[PDB]
Design a protein around this ligand. Sequence first.
Ligand SMILES: NC(=O)c1ccc[n+]([C@@H]2O[C@H](COP(=O)([O-])OP(=O)(O)OC[C@H]3O[C@@H](n4cnc5c(N)ncnc54)[C@H](OP(=O)(O)O)[C@@H]3O)[C@@H](O)[C@H]2O)c1
Ligand SMILES: NC(=O)c1ccc[n+]([C@@H]2O[C@H](COP(=O)([O-])OP(=O)(O)OC[C@H]3O[C@@H](n4cnc5c(N)ncnc54)[C@H](OP(=O)(O)O)[C@@H]3O)[C@@H](O)[C@H]2O)c1
Ligand SMILES: O=C(O)COCCOCCO
Ligand SMILES: O=C(O)COCCOCCO
Lengths: 364, 364
Amino acid sequence: GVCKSYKSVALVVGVTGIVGSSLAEVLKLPDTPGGPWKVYGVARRPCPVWLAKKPVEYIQCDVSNNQETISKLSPLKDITHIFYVSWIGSEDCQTNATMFKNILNSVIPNASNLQHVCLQTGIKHYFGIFEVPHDSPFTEDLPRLNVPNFYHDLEDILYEETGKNNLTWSVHRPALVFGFSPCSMMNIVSTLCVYATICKHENKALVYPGSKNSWNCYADAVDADLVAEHEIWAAVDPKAKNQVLNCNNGDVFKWKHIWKKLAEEFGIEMVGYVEGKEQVSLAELMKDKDQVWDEIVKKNNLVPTKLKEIAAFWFADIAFCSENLISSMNKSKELGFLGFRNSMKSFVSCIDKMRDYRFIPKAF
Amino acid sequence: GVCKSYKSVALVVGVTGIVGSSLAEVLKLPDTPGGPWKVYGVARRPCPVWLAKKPVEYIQCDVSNNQETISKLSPLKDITHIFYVSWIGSEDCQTNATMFKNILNSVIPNASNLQHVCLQTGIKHYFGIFEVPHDSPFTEDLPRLNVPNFYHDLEDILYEETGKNNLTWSVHRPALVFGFSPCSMMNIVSTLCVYATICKHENKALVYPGSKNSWNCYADAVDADLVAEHEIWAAVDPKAKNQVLNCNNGDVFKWKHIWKKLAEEFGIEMVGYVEGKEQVSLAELMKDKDQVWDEIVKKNNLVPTKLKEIAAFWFADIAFCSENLISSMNKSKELGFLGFRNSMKSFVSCIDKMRDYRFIPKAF
Ligand SMILES: NC(=O)c1ccc[n+]([C@@H]2O[C@H](COP(=O)([O-])OP(=O)(O)OC[C@H]3O[C@@H](n4cnc5c(N)ncnc54)[C@H](OP(=O)(O)O)[C@@H]3O)[C@@H](O)[C@H]2O)c1
Ligand SMILES: NC(=O)c1ccc[n+]([C@@H]2O[C@H](COP(=O)([O-])OP(=O)(O)OC[C@H]3O[C@@H](n4cnc5c(N)ncnc54)[C@H](OP(=O)(O)O)[C@@H]3O)[C@@H](O)[C@H]2O)c1
Ligand SMILES: O=C(O)COCCOCCO
Ligand SMILES: O=C(O)COCCOCCO
């Protein structure tokens, strides 16, 4: 029969990532703006089984290799929108820049109907890198800090390449992401579910390892599905074009309240913040747990994951010494994007979803 | 000619108040839900000139007097919606309760097409009175505190009288209100504009008198027009009926940032929070300034106001020792109300509006 017709064709670079995996779902929903969408999903690893059960055309490609990327993406003549939702896993400015340049150099000369490039960075734009920050609430008019942030390099490539080629652009700066991918290098919900699961397995309480300040302060986050919706909005709506845009759930929460919910969701005792205690390292608490995780996977018949891949304990340790990082959604709301989530409900939805996918044990 | 036709008829109780004055405007806009609206506006004082220039039918009535209230409101047979946006100016539970009972007892037996009662209370529901608070973000499922809050008494009357008479109800709990009325007993924007104006008049800097914590913490507020919109939404939309609902602008701000903007708006030097200083009383700083204000009114040809009526320095002193009071808008958003304001823009809009109305001097 005949070749299928699509209104829009997405290239999702980082399709196994915390946002890319949500784009793989949201782009294929019937009422999604710009649909019907065809989705090409790029990542470096072989396609996981969980993603092979989705109507996404997977392209295995190391996007840090220019020749390989040209070979794999230059045939894709029908792309209309690029969603760059990847990073190399370190803060190296040049390796990250190379990945994004390779996508653009392979696609721009070959996709005659290309319209738009979405670049995903983050709120680290406002306060620095992990290796003086702005005061908050963070707004998109704040200037770059004088530090070597790879986000700066990615933006500079975006502006140059889109300007030369009459393409529109958007920069998306999500808050901390609440999502479900077990292949992410920075997935807080999965990290905390894994910790809770190990505590439950060992008959131990859910002990909060963080700082006092992070227990009590206001924090914010963004559901991965909302980031997907926001990127799609900017890809399709002329009002959003050529803009830098924050993305968060629209509300605030406290880790104190999340912690209680996490313990309830796993049916275990909570030990909250104890007055006078200093933060301890969750990465250190978990450093010898690789074989315990392997045993838990086997006992619960989970999708097989390596502990350091499903969990990022180092990233929880950063979250638990952070404060004063709230970002503003006013610019997006003023431009007409009114999407939101209840963050407490979002956190629980992500636990539910990871259980459905068999990444984390069911409640017992 | 013929009697005019209206779709809805509002009784705004407290029409000179910080929210009632905004209802007097929003209800008469062409695209307001439930329109066209007829507006009866009730307050105790003689109608101010500023309000007489609006298409509102003013009813001067002391609503604490039952016989008087019956006499003045029982003839109003066409009322469809009540907006109770008043309080007596003290925390006395019985005088406040009497005012609201008198409205209901005068209207319910006489307005055959009455549909709905909107009751405005506030976030003090969650943390106590001015004479242990809940942790935040505050949500509408939080139980009453064991304290004598007149809000409890008002709610109890609302539920009883609406239930007996097959009426719908809503309870609105606004955050700190950003508005323009110079007749309010609690108008923070006007209070701070008056302080700034006195500082400017005396060739003094805009000295922040508050606490460290209130300078740096996250705070929230609500534009009076947004409270009006929210009350009207609940009055007209079946989804919102019989609900307790918070109302805020949807974002957060810091007083540190507001203070800089206030100084810029008045063209004067800012002295922000100074490390190590304790809060001082703005009420004490201003206690002898009544005649200075009279002179400023005369010199700038302002609408004549008494200092203690246009400004509430005591209320600024409470704002400047408050922290941890953020409220959630998730319930309203989940029920479909997506109204919002940028709080920094709202604050400036209120300064602009008070200058337009000649309550506060123009920029010079
Ligand atoms: N996660 C958060 O909470 C968060 C919050 C705010 C902002 N951000 C920012 O969002 C951006 C994207 O990160 P993310 O967290 O969404 O990523 P992520 O969940 O860690 O996913 C990374 C994705 O990039 C792919 N990738 C990495 N190296 C690749 C290569 N050489 N070739 C092809 N694919 C490659 C990965 O696939 P493979 O594993 O196969 O390589 C995976 O699909 C970053 O700038 C990050 O700082 C993240
Ligand atoms: N202002 C805020 O920032 C704020 C924030 C959150 C919640 N709230 C709550 O909102 C509710 C309403 O207060 P508000 O601040 O909107 O009020 P407001 O600005 O102080 O206005 C009070 C109104 O009530 C009228 N009033 C008072 N006593 C009256 C009487 N005996 N007879 C007739 N009218 C009378 C006043 O008219 P006259 O002067 O003529 O008497 C005025 O119109 C209160 O429960 C308050 O705590 C206020
Ligand atoms: O937003 C980004 O640029 C990366 O995520 C930062 C998370 O914020 C620190 C606490 O985890
Ligand atoms: O919300 C209410 O019930 C009354 O206003 C409270 C203002 O909050 C304290 C700091 O000003």
